Amino acid sequence: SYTASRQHLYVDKNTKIICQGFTGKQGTFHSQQALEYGTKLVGGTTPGKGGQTHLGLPVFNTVKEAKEQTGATASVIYVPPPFAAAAINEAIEAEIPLVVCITQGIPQQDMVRVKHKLLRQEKTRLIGPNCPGVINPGECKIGIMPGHIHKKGRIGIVSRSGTLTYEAVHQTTQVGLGQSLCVGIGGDPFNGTDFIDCLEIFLNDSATEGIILIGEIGGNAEENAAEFLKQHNSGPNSKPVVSFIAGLTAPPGRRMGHAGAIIAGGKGGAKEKISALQSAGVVVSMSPAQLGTTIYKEFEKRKMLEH
Amino acid sequence: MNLQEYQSKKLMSDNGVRVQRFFVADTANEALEAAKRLNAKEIVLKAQILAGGRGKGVFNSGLKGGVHLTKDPNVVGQLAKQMIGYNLATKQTPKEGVKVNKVMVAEALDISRETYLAILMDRSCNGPVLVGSPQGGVDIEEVAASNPELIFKEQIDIFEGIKDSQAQRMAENLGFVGPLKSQAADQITKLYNLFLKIDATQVEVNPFGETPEGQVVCFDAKINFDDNAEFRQKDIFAMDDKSENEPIENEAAKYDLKYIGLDGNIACFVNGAGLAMATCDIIFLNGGKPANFLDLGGGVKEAQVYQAFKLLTADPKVEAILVNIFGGIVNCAIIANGITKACRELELKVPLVVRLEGTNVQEAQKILNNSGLPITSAIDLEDAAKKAVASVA
Numbered sequence: 001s002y003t004a005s006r007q008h009l010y011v012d013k014n015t016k017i018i019c020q021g022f023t024g025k026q027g028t029f030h031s032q033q034a035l036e037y038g039t040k041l042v043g044g045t046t047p048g049k050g051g052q053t054h055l056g057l058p059v060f061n062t063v064k065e066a067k068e069q070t071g072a073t074a075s076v077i078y079v080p081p082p083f084a085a086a087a088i089n090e091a092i093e094a095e096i097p098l099v100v101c102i103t104q105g106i107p108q109q110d111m112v113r114v115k116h117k118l119l120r121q122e123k124t125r126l127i128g129p130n131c132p133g134v135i136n137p138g139e140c141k142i143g144i145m146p147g148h149i150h151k152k153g154r155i156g157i158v159s160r161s162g163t164l165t166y167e168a169v170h171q172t173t174q175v176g177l178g179q180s181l182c183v184g185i186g187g188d189p190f191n192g193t194d195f196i197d198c199l200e201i202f203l204n205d206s207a208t209e210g211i212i213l214i215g216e217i218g219g220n221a222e223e224n225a226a227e228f229l230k231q232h233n234s235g236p237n238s239k240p241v242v243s244f245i246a247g248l249t250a251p252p253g254r255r256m257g258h259a260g261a262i263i264a265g266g267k268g269g270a271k272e273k274i275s276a277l278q279s280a281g282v283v284v285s286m287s288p289a290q291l292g293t294t295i296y297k298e299f300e301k302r303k304m305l306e307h
Numbered sequence: 308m309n310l311q312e313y314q315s316k317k318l319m320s321d322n323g324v325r326v327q328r329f330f331v332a333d334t335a336n337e338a339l340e341a342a343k344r345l346n347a348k349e350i351v352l353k354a355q356i357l358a359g360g361r362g363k364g365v366f367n368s369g370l371k372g373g374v375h376l377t378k379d380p381n382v383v384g385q386l387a388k389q390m391i392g393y394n395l396a397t398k399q400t401p402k403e404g405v406k407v408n409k410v411m412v413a414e415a416l417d418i419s420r421e422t423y424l425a426i427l428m429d430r431s432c433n434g435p436v437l438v439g440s441p442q443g444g445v446d447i448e449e450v451a452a453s454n455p456e457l458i459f460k461e462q463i464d465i466f467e468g469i470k471d472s473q474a475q476r477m478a479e480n481l482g483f484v485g486p487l488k489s490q491a492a493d494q495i496t497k498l499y500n501l502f503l504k505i506d507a508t509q510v511e512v513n514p515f516g517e518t519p520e521g522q523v524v525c526f527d528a529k530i531n532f533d534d535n536a537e538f539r540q541k542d543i544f545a546m547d548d549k550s551e552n553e554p555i556e557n558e559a560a561k562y563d564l565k566y567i568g569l570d571g572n573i574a575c576f577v578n579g580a581g582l583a584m585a586t587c588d589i590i591f592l593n594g595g596k597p598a599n600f601l602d603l604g605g606g607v608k609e610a611q612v613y614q615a616f617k618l619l620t621a622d623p624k625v626e627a628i629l630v631n632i633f634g635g636i637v638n639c640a641i642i643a644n645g646i647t648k649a650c651r652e653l654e655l656k657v658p659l660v661v662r663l664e665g666t667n668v669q670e671a672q673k674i675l676n677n678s679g680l681p682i683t684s685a686i687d688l689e690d691a692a693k694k695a696v697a698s699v700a
């Protein structure tokens with residue numbers, strides 16, 4: 001089933017990348033940053049510009065063309081909302097092992113159709129849309145995250161918020177722990193990767209010794225992850241998990257930017273997610289500035305720091 | 308966005324959904340003539356405002372009640388004269404109320420059974436779901452806590468569409484019997500196709516009722532629209548009635564900005580929905596009250612930054628401003644240029660706390676360092692919240 005593609009989240013130095021929307025404003029700027037970061041970006045697609053050259057790399061009309069000619073195993077999408085669901089579907093049809101969609105604003109009904117296709121195959125793993133991407137620090141950067149805040153290390157981070165991902169990375173770099181793999185799953189209600197998907201990778205990754213899970217109001221994905229952690233991360237060799245849930249003070253009945261982020265029909269509150277995660281043994285930092293220090297202290301108690 | 312009742316019921320009626328026959332009237336005399344054109348035993352007159360509680364509202368002209376029933380078109384016009392042009396206040400409007408420019412004049416209909424029926428995009432189910440209950444006329448959340456056994460659902464495949472089998476089964480679980488069941492199922496089908504046609508996130512009918520004469524009618528309804536589909540729903544979004552939205556929020560929307568006004572005195576200028584929520588939260592944690600939520604998103608242009616910053620300096624409640632940017636796709640230098648341009652036209656007179664990190668952070672700090680503005684620098688999110696709370700307390 002589609003869960004068989006979870007492994008494709010763990011990009012590394014050997015992952016080669018194409019960029020859909022390569023020649024647009026944002027595809028160009030963040031492709032430049034990826035190039036400077038050392039990531040193996042080998043080309044991109046822009047229908048109608050196949051054959052051209054961009055940032056010193058070939059442009060193709062189609063994903064299948066670009067995949068065959070470059071051997072890319074991942075794609076990142078900087079396509080505008082009216083066309084981005086089609087772009088995702090093209091990458092799925094081309095059996096790109098990993099697809100990351102940065103685009104904000106894809107109609108929910110479009111993403112319903114995209115998930116229908118996605119769930120009925122397992123060659124392609126989707127991260128997003130409306131997400132920052134994924135990064136294996138020092139090895140492979142796929143998205144918009146500022147490169148210079150990362151340091152390869154020991155903490156796996158999964159977040160529904162792009163900018164809170166940067167905060168969690170920055171804080172774990174500061175306290176010296178670093179990051180093993182960072183996945184932003186995005187703020188949209190229909191997406192390709194949830195918390196449990198990333199927690200499976202994290203719990204089975206020896207490089208990942210602790211986990212930061214960042215969530216927010218809306219939906220039940222945090223409650224689901226709590227139960228998954230209850231059953232799969234309760235042993236004596238359990239990995240510490242620290243979390244922050246945004247929106248404790250948010251007003252009810254309002255979309256807080258993210259389509260996903262809404263307290264509706266008395267469901268989706270933050271404290272309910274905090275209590276659920278606490279019941280699973282997760283340590284919830286009340287302040288979003290203290291994720292790094294909170295997980296450092298959890299490492300200290302467990303005698304996990306080198307010192 | 309929001310639609311008036313007459314707009315949403317027209318949209319439903321033009322798509323085959325059975326509603327109460329009705330006219331909309333801009334004047335009392337038009338309402339009186341509308342009442343005559345209906346030629347119905349009884350008539351309902353309804354003030355058109357978006358807020359709720361119209362039943363118990365009171366007009367600044369003295370008329371108590373926004374919904375009235377009468378069998379006499381003359382009473383309809385008499386009542387309308389006290390509604391149109393007059394502000395209708397209710398439990399969910401400001402004490403001033405809402406200027407009523409239109410009233411609905413519709414055929415009143417006896418309700419012999421009330422049910423609940425909705426279609427929504429369900430995140431858990433990964434697509435559209437029919438939700439129904441024979442317990443009509445009450446908050447569906449109250450039915451789900453008291454009698455969850457009476458909440459029925461069907462998962463609709465997005466490519467296959469609603470099947471007749473699913474519409475029939477939901478009609479039966481709602482109590483519809485015999486001929487009324489085929490009516491109900493065909494209305495369920497039409498509501499579902501409408502829901503897809505208009506990029507709704509939810510279409511909610513309550514009561515989805517029967518009349519003694521054997522009609523299945525959607526008596527009241529609420530539609531929530533997917534803002535992300537505006538580019539392919541121009542006609543519907545043109546009808547958006549912003550007359551009851553908070554004014555600063557309306558201003559921000561003109562520039563593709565998401566502003567939600569709160570009750571505090573510390574303004575927030577943040578990128579990202581998560582960081583923006585977390586900034587409100589960490590201000591509260593440190594003893595302050597945030598004045599607003601603001602999600603600066605994606606590829607911000609300098610003009611948008613400039614306009615968004617001015618939304619904060621014009622709120623009378625703001626006593627300090629907290630700028631907190633962690634830029635990935637957002638370019639910190641564009642933030643810096645937009646803020647400085649806004650401050651050059653203001654006296655300020657409010658503390659300005661600034662935390663910047665991420666994309667092009669270095670250039671942005673130079674812009675701010677050369678600007679001559681009285682800025683309080685912050686090293687991290689906790690430092691920024693503590694400095695913002697201190698500056699006003």
Ligand SMILES: CC(C)(COP(=O)(O)OP(=O)(O)OC[C@H]1O[C@@H](n2cnc3c(N)ncnc32)[C@H](O)[C@@H]1OP(=O)(O)O)[C@@H](O)C(=O)NCCC(=O)NCCS
Pocket residue numbers: 020021022023024025026027045046047077078079080081083086087102103104105130131132144161162163186604605606636
């Ligand atoms: C996706 C997004 C970045 C694109 O904006 P942009 O880069 O300013 O847009 P542009 O129009 O400059 O470029 C997009 C390109 O896609 C191309 N394109 C269109 N359809 C395409 C397709 N199916 N496949 C590939 N490229 C396609 C266009 O041709 C255009 O390139 P061109 O100008 O060379 O012709 C923007 O719409 C967006 O979503 N921004 C917000 C992102 C965000 O904040 N996400 C959340 C992060 S947590």
Ligand SMILES: [Mg+2]
Pocket residue numbers: 162257579580604605
């Ligand atoms: Mg965002």
